[PDB]
Design a protein around this ligand. Structure first.
Ligand SMILES: [Zn+2]
Lengths: 66, 1340, 288, 251
DNA sequence: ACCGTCATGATCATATTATTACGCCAGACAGGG
DNA sequence: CCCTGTCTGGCGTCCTCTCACCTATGATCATGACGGT
RNA sequence: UUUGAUUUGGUGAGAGG
């Protein structure tokens, strides 16, 4: 279901901007999880270009130049 | 006959039903409750005496001392209301209490105390109520609002359906005490019976029945009947009453008297019961399998062994029968446990019980209350006697005992406040009866189960909580000191009492700030039945059913006036005729319809007495005697409307206005509006603003005079008489002699309230509306208030409206207004803003208010005087200086020589920086009033001494004029007495006037009266001396103020806001609208007479938003103005009074059987000219709510004027000058300006201040802030492909500080470019997550 | 309430009628003012489950996609195929309904001209590409989404479709509320699916399968009606037959579950003993 | 920070940290003094509950409180909830160069432009006006320009009509549900104090004119002006994204 | 008029108790056929 | 040991505007006013 | 070895859309 599916994501900021932050931050902390940003709300949190709209060319460039 | 202000402008009144009970005093809830609270009340209850006699006498911890109670008394307040609102104090009265200390001796607490002491003691300050029904807490006029909560008593609810997911309903029985521990009996899906106390852990219910010292044999004696088995020579015969066998299938062939009655495999019919009870069958025969599961009642013991044969509440087997049969028992008592009739709920409950006696039950109850501690029999007895059975911790009120006896079908409604054994046993009996299928559950929203608290009861409860804290303190101190040496003011202290009552009146959830911008808004905020607050529900949790109108709100709580939004139906408003019962419920009037005739006696019914009887509807036709003219009449029996016969009715409603409230009974043609639009119309009629010259409603309901006079904005005459001196400040009434006291000679002075600030920044003015030499009657208006006119209620103004689409400028809901409206200065409302400036006390020294100010020149300081404060009258702009104040210097550059002060200049060389505190802008105004308050000790400057001399001079002149005016009335009394009995016609005015007593006159009533007037005169002399000394003391003294403030300067700006595109106007039916274009005069659609229409609405809002009442209001307003134009035509031609009398009489008859029936033949040729002087701007018409003016009456009144019958005039155009096809509707609608203006919402920000913890802009308008680019807007920009717009929308424009300074340099240099960076609030997120044990980082 | 409000608004409502009206309108205001919270929280949950999904390819390179048919509840055909397959790219190439023709190719966007050439040929159902069958890792390819919907063309490489989709489902949350036998209507041809049947003694084709779908196909080829016929019903008609408009074609008794057979013969009571297994209840009012 | 007065309105975290440090100092002193077992067990237990109350308050039994009965807000309550950092300061931010006022109709507009008042226009475009004033040469330092627009002389309105001309703004109605609730217009200056909004566009915003309010936002940088003109312009949103139906239907 | 006594205001660490009245809806837990 | 009531936690709409209200105390040196010589 | 204007926090109640 949609709230169990958005809280079970491979990106803990996406699952922490949404409902309960305690459960998700302890699960991510004891798992040692890492957030390869790669979505819209991680980049709205961290303050950069959205990887969808005009910023999709910027993220193509950055993903190409690694 | 009519009162003299009702011969000024007598309102035309349609309406058919002759009234029998007039509208009561609309503020009776507040005033009657608080009069019930604070008054010397004998016989114990109610009031403060209930608290002082329930918490006292405080007896000590076995020290034989006792602090008992005598009486109480409130002294006068030190400050009256006006000085209290000006200065800022509470409006309180000191509560003196006479307490007594007695101290008993040793070995005889029934012996003599050695010493008593009775004395006066100070405790608390309770705030009094003003005559308007409001409180003044800290200079701001506040209202405590009535609460609607659950009635104390038993309550049998049914948890229907939802539990256990199998449809098996539960039943709980919540006992709701007024003060103490709750008690919930309930069931479970195993059909066991479970008690709980205050929502704690759950126990089986009969554990409390053992706690009341019941043995198990007695419990089964109570909760079941008995079945008798007699062992008489054959198969253990049975006593049988066949009523238990109603529908049961027997296991054998029941025969008796040698006759087969019942066959095996069949059930016992009702006629077989009739056979067995007709033949009087007693003993029948049972098999050995019949008592295989019968449950024994009491214990049987064997006499030989001394053991127990079978325990109580146990099923019987073969061996148990074999044991008790050979022990000598012939009688066997069992229980009847049926499927439908009587379940064994008590029996299964006792089988779940582990306990066996009183002690174990008390131990288990003591253990579920306080978990995990050693119980002791004394502690368990003390706890269970202090839960329910003590006068201290448990108290149903009289309301609680009434509901608890009524819902258990008792007789006496009087009982103790504590419970007993019979009470809990009757609760369990009624719960088992509801589970058995007979009897009904009780709904919650039924208004026989919703009590109304008010100001008096809630203040009593908060005062009682203060008293139980202070009895903790007095029980501490009384037995821990030396006696006798102390007095009962060293023990009791006034801090918790005053803290409790000051916290309740100061900040509660029900002691709220009065919405005061309108007389209607006052008188409908004081009448409010809020469901929220302490003890009630909350907005974001509940619910569905409580937000819905129950069938018993009819005539108690208004169905259509409630705030839409998050709390609909919780902020209910009480109706017009709805009183409050003795206990606290709602009651409403009715007319006792005896068998044929509607008797005109009123008779108050509550919410549960209404259900049993049958009530006729309000507007039922009756022919002059009371006989109902139909033979089917619409009534309502038990919450359900229907059609009943002519003479099975028992009550009729009083008047047809009683379902609605006073907010929504000033709406004309309410029965034509759909209920949503009537709701929005009543709410916006509450939200109006007072204009400059309020006019009148042409189409009212006649309810305006009750709302105006029964509020407190007009100056109602106390004693009638003759006016002597009218002024814009004061009004002097000379009291008539047939209304007048013998002593205290008496001519009254009304000091009006001129231009001062309301709470909503409106302008609460009072204008005198009486002439000079004019008679006034007792109970009559003298000075109109805000939004009043001649004692009526004029909220907005009435304007010429047309319904037509006009070139798109009224597209959705907009309104288009001619410039003729703004030229006449007719919506030009007057607002007043209060600007405060304090002189605080900081380091490097105090502040300066003087005008020797750095960094400023002539152009600023020309508008200040020689001491900083702006003049009274100086018309300022947005951003000038009102009060000059200098201290801001901070620490720009640290003083080189530490604290070098005495060297260069005197004190210092302006520190390091200087900037005279200059103010903002956005508002104009004219400074009308300046207050200066000085903390005592501080040097008064020259303007504070100017204000002190000014107010000394004003108060000196005012008290001297009090003495002169009352002395003039006293000398007029002396002249009136000396007309007869030794009259001197020439000798009276030869001597000075102060000696009118020693003239020739014997010992009569007249020399006695002159001696009494000499007593009054010398009293006025010495009283004037002492009061002028006290008033000089009040002006000359300082005022207690904030910690570390020198002086407070308050300045009142008086803005005059006119009208502009963007304001919100609305009628009285829900037709809202932003006024969209202020056209010139020429563009308006005019008609074939010449007059332009003022406002062009939009027709398309009528068929969807179904408010068809505004079109009938428009047509009847045009009829009213047609009559007014014909009066203006018959008066402008200077016609004699005969033709005016003819036409006014024809315009006042005009209808069916109506109530008005006036005649002008008793107005005597001078009042008719003045009545026509008041009717020439239109004729006011009353239209009551549900008994209004029908269509044919509007047509007949439009035929009296020469207007067209259909109401529609053909209208030309202003632009083209050619006719609009299909003639349009014009008329007058009474439209209101609302105080949602457009130069209070408009705001703009380039770059202002920034918040401190997260570097983002501030929020709001007063703080110069930016609009929240919220989360859904971020989603809406992700939904496009806009990526750079969102990046600068949440990095550059908002948060990143180096990013935004780079941005500002780049914008002022022309390079549109952003250097992004990181949000600083994300670094705040890193510090808050990192401040836990969590290690968040940024890789690479 | 059994007594209506016989008075409109041009005539006056009296007191009781307005009070019943206020019942009906207070319920509506409470429903909107409490419905808006669930509508907003639904939009929040939807844009946070979507949140990631960005059009990131141009073709996933598949041949799978859902089978868009017109939807039919049992009345007249509710939502036509042109509403469901407008602007969505076909999965395999749609055969023209005559015989084996390449009417449209296998990767064409179906705009209005293609949908009109679908409606002229009366095309049955289109196998079209759906977003749930997209093979793209971490995103949705440009063909399996479909038309842009506010642009006439296909979705561009980049445009966030999860957020516009979540907003478009949750945005109408305010307008939504919060709190015998078969009679044919038109006149066409019968077809049966999921059917295993047998002819009874009288002739009415009874069905030995519970899950049988009774379709009414017209003379053109498209499916115009559909119904569900229970196990053991009396069908007045048969397979492939032509009927008249309004003629009853189905009959059953839902209160009596039929235990009808396939063959004939005699009846024996196997493990049916009166006293323990079955019971004797002779009827009262009939005698049989 | 102190509020208006002479006292400091202290935060809740300072109460939490100050209690943990008070208890930790007490526990160090008791382990210095060699108190018995039950004293240091209560002391360490009070420290455990103090730390557990600092981190996530109220997850243990009934939460501690300072004033008056309301519990005080801890670190986890600075993160979680509707008013934490995610939902209140990182997903939604307060925004400079933004404005807000009551809307009204103005049916003379073309549907790519909206009316915008002169007072709001001179406040939202202060840096562009400063840059324009510094380009002409009328003034010198920045102060002079801020005095000029604080006085509002006769020459800054031509400057304002030369910064408006081709510069779109984002109008936004306050409950934005779908993407058609943020649309970009070109301003046309209004004598008045109310945003004039083209009527057809109202059916997209669900905006009637019964007292509604809208916010204006300014695209600062150049890529944002181009995104407002090329993606978010009101001429570009004529079909609703939920379906194929036109959203500029005449109402 | 100077010297001594009662009174009254600054600075400063000490550390937590006597109400109840939402409605689902998952998720984990002791109980028992 | 697989169902099962029962208990515990965790949600519950965005944007805006106005107003008022904000912990007690328990102990002492030193200043400050009052009275005798 | 001497250039600087800078900052108004939780709680609860009520209204508009
Ligand atoms: Zn794909």
């Amino acid at each position: 279901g949609i709230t169990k599916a958005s809280l079970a994501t491979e990106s803990f900021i996406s699952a922490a901007s949404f409902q309960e932050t305690t459960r998700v931050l302890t699960e991510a902390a004891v798992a040692g999880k890492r957030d390869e940003l790669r979505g819209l709300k991680e980049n709205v949190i961290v303050g950069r270009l959205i990887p969808a709209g005009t910023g999709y060319a910027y993220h193509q460039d950055r993903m190409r130049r690694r | 006959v009519y009162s003299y202000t009702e011969k000024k402008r007598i309102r035309k009144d349609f309406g058919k039903r002759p009234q029998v009970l007039d509208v009561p005093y609309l503020l009776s809830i507040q005033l009657d409750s608080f009069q019930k609270f604070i008054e010397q009340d004998p016989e114990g209850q109610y009031g403060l005496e209930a608290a002082f006699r329930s918490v006292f006498p405080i007896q000590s911890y076995s020290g034989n001392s006792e602090l008992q109670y005598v009486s109480y008394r409130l002294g006068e307040p030190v400050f009256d209301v006006q000085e209290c609102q000006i200065r800022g104090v509470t409006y309180s009265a000191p509560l003196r209490v006479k307490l007594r200390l007695v101290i008993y001796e040793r070995e005889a607490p029934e012996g003599t105390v050695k010493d008593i002491k009775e004395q006066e003691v100070y405790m608390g300050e309770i705030p009094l109520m003003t005559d308007n029904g409001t409180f003044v807490i800290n200079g701001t006029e506040r209202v405590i609002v009535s609460q609607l909560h659950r009635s104390p008593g038993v309550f049998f609810d049914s948890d229907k359906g939802k539990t256990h997911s199998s449809g098996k309903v539960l039943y709980n029985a919540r006992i709701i005490p007024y003060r103490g521990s709750w008690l919930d009996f309930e069931f479970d899906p195993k059909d066991n019976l479970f008690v709980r106390i205050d929502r704690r852990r759950k126990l089986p219910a009969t554990i409390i029945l053992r706690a009341l010292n019941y043995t198990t044999e007695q419990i089964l004696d109570l909760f079941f009947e008995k079945v008798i088995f007699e062992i008489r020579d054959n198969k253990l015969q049975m006593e049988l009453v066949p009523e238990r066998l109603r529908g049961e299938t027997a296991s054998f062939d029941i025969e008796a008297n040698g006759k087969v009655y019942v066959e095996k495999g069949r059930r016992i019919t009702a006629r077989h019961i009739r056979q067995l009870e007709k033949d009087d069958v007693k003993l029948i025969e049972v098999p050995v399998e019949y008592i295989a599961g019968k449950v024994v009642a009491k214990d049987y013991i064997d006499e030989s062994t001394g053991e127990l044969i079978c325990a109580a509440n146990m099923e019987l087997s073969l061996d148990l029968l074999a044991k008790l049969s050979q022990s000598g028992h012939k009688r066997i008592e069992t229980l009847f446990t049926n499927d439908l009739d009587h379940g064994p709920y008590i029996s299964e409950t006792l089988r779940v019980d582990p306990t066996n006696d009183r002690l174990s039950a008390l131990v288990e109850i003591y253990r579920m209350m306080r978990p995990g501690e050693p119980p002791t029999r004394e502690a368990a007895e003390s706890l269970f006697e202090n839960l329910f059975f003590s006068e201290d911790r448990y108290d149903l009120s009289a309301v609680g005992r009434m509901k608890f006896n009524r819902s258990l079908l008792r007789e006496e409604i009087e009982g103790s406040g504590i419970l007993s054994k019979d009470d809990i046993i009757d609760v369990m009996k009624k719960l088992i009866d509801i589970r058995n299928g007979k009897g009904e559950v009780d709904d919650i929203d039924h208004l026989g189960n919703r009590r109304i608290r008010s100001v008096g009861e809630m203040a009593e409860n908060q005062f009682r909580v203060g008293l139980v804290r202070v009895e903790r303190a007095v029980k501490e101190r009384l037995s821990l000191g030396d006696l006798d040496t102390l007095m009962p003011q060293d023990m009791i202290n006034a801090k918790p009492i005053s803290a409790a009552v000051k916290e309740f009146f100061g900040s509660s959830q029900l002691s709220q700030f009065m919405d005061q911008n309108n007389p209607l808004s006052e008188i409908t905020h004081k009448r409010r039945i809020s469901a929220l607050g302490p003890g009630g529900l909350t907005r974001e949790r509940a619910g569905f059913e409580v937000r819905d109108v129950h069938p018993t709100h009819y005539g108690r709580v208004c169905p259509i006036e409630t705030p839409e939004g998050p709390n609909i139906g919780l902020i209910n408003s009480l109706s017009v005729y709805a009183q409050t019962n003795e206990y606290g419920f709602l009651e409403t009037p009715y007319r006792k319809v005896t068998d044929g005739v509607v008797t005109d006696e009123i008779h108050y019914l509550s919410a549960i007495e209404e259900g049993n009887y049958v009530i006729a509807q309000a507007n039922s036709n009756l022919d002059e005697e009371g006989h109902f003219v139909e033979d089917l009449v619409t009534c309502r029996s038990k919450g359900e409307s229907s059609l009943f016969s002519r003479d099975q009715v028992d009550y009729m409603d009083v008047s047809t206005q009683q379902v609605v409230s006073v907010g929504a009974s000033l709406i004309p043609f309410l029965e034509h509006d759909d209920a949503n639009r009537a709701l929005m119309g009543a709410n916006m009629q509450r939200q109006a603003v007072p204009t400059l010259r309020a006019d009148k409603p042409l189409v009212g309901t006649g309810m305006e005079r009750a709302v105006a006079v029964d509020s407190g904005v007009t100056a109602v005459a106390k004693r009638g008489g003759v006016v002597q001196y009218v002024d814009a400040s004061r009004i002097v009434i000379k009291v008539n002699e047939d209304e007048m006291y013998p002593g205290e000679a008496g001519i009254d002075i009304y000091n009006l309230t001129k231009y001062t600030r309301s709470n909503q920044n409106t302008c609460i003015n009072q204008m005198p509306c009486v002439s000079l030499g004019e008679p006034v009657e007792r109970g009559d208006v003298l000075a109109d208030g805000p939004s009043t006119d001649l004692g009526e209620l004029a909220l907005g103004q009435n304007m010429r409206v047309a319904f037509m689409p006009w070139n798109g400028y009224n597209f959705e809901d907009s309104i288009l207004v001619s410039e003729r409206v703004v030229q006449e200065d007719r919506f030009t409302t007057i607002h007043i803003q209060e600007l405060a400036c304090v002189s605080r006390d900081t380091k490097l020294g105090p502040e300066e208010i003087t005008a020797d100010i750095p960094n400023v020149g002539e152009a600023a300081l020309s508008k200040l005087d020689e001491s900083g404060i702006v003049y009274i009258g100086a018309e300022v702009t947005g951003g000038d200086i009102l009060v000059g104040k200098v201290t801001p210097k901070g620490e720009t550059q640290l003083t080189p020589e530490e604290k070098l002060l005495r060297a260069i200049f005197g004190e210092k060389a302006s520190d390091v920086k200087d900037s005279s505190l200059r103010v903002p802008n956005g508002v104009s105004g004219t400074v009308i009033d300046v207050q200066v308050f000085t903390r005592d000790g501080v040097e008064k400057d020259k303007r504070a001494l100017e204000i002190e001399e000014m107010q000394l001079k004003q108060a000196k002149k005012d008290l001297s004029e009090e003495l002169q005016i009352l002395e003039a009335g006293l000398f007029s009394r002396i002249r009136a007495v000396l007309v007869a009995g030794g009259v001197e016609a020439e000798k009276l005015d030869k001597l000075p006037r102060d000696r009118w007593l020693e003239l020739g006159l014997t010992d009569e009533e007249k020399q006695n009266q002159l001696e009494q007037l000499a007593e009054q005169y010398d009293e006025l002399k010495h009283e004037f001396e002492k009061k002028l000394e006290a008033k000089r003391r009040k002006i000359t003294q300082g005022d207690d103020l904030a910690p570390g403030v020198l002086k407070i300067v308050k300045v009142y700006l008086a803005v005059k806001r006119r009208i502009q595109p963007g304001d919100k106007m609305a009628g009285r039916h829900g037709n809202k609208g932003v006024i969209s274009k202020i056209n010139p005069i020429e563009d308006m659609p005019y008609d074939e007479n010449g007059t332009p229409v003022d406002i062009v609405l939009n027709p398309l809002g009528v068929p969807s938003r179904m408010n068809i009442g505004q079109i009938l209001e428009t047509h009847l307003g045009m009829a009213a103005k047609g009559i007014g134009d014909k009066i203006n035509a018959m008066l402008k031609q200077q016609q004699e009074v005969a033709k005016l009398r003819e036409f006014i009489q024809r315009a006042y008859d005009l209808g069916a059987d109506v109530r008005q029936k006036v005649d002008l033949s008793t107005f005597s040729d001078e009042e008719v000219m003045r009545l026509a002087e008041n009717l020439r701007k239109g004729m006011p018409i009353a239209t009551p709510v549900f008994d209004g003016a029908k269509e044919a009456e509007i047509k007949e009144l439009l035929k009296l004027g020469d207007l067209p019958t259909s109401g529609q005039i053909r209208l030309y155009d202003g632009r083209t000058g050619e006719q609009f096809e299909r003639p349009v509707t014009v008329g007058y609608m009474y439209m209101l300006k609302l105080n949602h203006l457009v130069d209070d919402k408009m705001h703009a920000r380039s770059t202002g201040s920034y918040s401190l913890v997260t570097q983002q802009p501030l929020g709001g308008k007063a703080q110069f802030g930016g609009q929240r680019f919220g989360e859904m807007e971020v989603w809406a920009l992700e939904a496009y492909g806009a990526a750079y717009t969102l990046q600068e929308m949440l990095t550059v424009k908002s948060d990143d500080v180096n990013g935004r300074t780079k941005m500002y340099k780049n914008i002022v240099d022309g390079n549109h470019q952003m250097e992004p960076g990181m949000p600083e609030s994300f670094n705040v997120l890193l510090k808050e997550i990192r401040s836990l044990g969590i290690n968040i980082e940024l890789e690479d | 309430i059994e007594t209506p409000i016989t008075a409109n608004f041009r005539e006056g409502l009296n007191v009781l009628q307005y009070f019943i009206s206020t019942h009906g309108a207070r319920k509506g205001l409470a429903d909107t003012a409490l419905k808006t919270a669930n509508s907003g929280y639904l939009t929040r949950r939807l844009v946070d489950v979507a949140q990631d999904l960005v059009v990131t390819e141009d073709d996933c390179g598949t041949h799978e996609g859902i089978m868009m048919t017109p939807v039919i509840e049992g009345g007249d055909v509710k939502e036509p195929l042109r509403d469901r397959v407008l602007g969505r790219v076909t999965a395999e190439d749609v055969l023209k309904p005559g015989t084996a023709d390449i009417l449209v190719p296998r990767n064409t966007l179906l705009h209005e001209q293609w949908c009109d050439l679908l409606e002229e040929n009366s095309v049955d159902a289109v196998k079209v590409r759906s977003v749930v069958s997209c093979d793209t890792d971490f995103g949705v390819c440009a063909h399996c989404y479909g038309r842009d919907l506010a642009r006439g063309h296909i979705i561009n490489k980049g445009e966030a479709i999860g957020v516009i989709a979540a907003q478009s489902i949750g945005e109408p949350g305010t307008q939504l509320t919060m709190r015998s036998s078969i009679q044919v209507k038109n006149k066409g041809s019968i077809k049966l699916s999921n059917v295993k049947s047998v002819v009874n003694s009288s002739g009415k084709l009874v069905i030995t399968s519970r899950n049988t779908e009774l379709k009414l196909i017209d003379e053109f080829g498209r499916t115009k009606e559909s119904y569900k016929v229970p196990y053991g019903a009396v069908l007045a008609k048969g397979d492939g037959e032509q009927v008249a408009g309004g003629e009853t074609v189905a009959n059953w008794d839902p209160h009596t579950m039929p235990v009808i057979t396939e063959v004939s013969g005699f009846v024996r009571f196997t493990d049916m003993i009166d006293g323990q297994t079955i019971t004797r209840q002779t009827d009262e009012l009939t005698g049989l | 920070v102190p509020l208006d007065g002479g006292r400091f309105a202290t935060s809740d975290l300072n109460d939490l940290y100050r209690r943990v440090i008070n208890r930790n100092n007490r526990l160090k002193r008791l382990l210095d003094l060699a108190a018995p077992d039950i004293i240091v067990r209560n002391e360490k237990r009070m420290l455990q509950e103090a730390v557990d109350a600092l981190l996530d308050n109220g997850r243990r039994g009934r939460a501690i409180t300072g004033s008056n009965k309301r519990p005080l807000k801890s670190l986890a309550d600075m993160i979680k909830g509707k008013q934490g950092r995610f939902r209140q300061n990182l997903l939604g931010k307060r925004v400079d160069y933004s404005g807000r006022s009551v809307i009204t109709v103005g049916p003379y507009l073309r549907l790519h432009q909206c009316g915008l008042p002169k007072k709001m226009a001179l406040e939202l475009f202060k840096p562009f006006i400063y840059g324009k004033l510094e380009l002409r040469g009328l003034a010198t330092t920045i102060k002079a320009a801020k005095k000029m627009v604080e006085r509002e002389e006769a020459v800054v309105w031509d400057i304002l009509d030369e910064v408006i001309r081709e510069h779109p703004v984002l109008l936004n109605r306050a409950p934005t549900l779908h993407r058609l609730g943020i649309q970009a217009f070109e301003p046309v200056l209004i004598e008045g104090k109310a945003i004039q909004l083209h009527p057809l566009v109202c059916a997209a915003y669900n905006a009637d004119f019964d007292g509604d309010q809208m916010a204006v936002h300014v695209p600062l940088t150049l890529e944002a002006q181009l995104e407002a003109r090329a993606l978010m312009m009101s001429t570009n949103n004529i079909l609703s994204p939920a379906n194929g139906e036109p959203i500029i239907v005449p109402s």
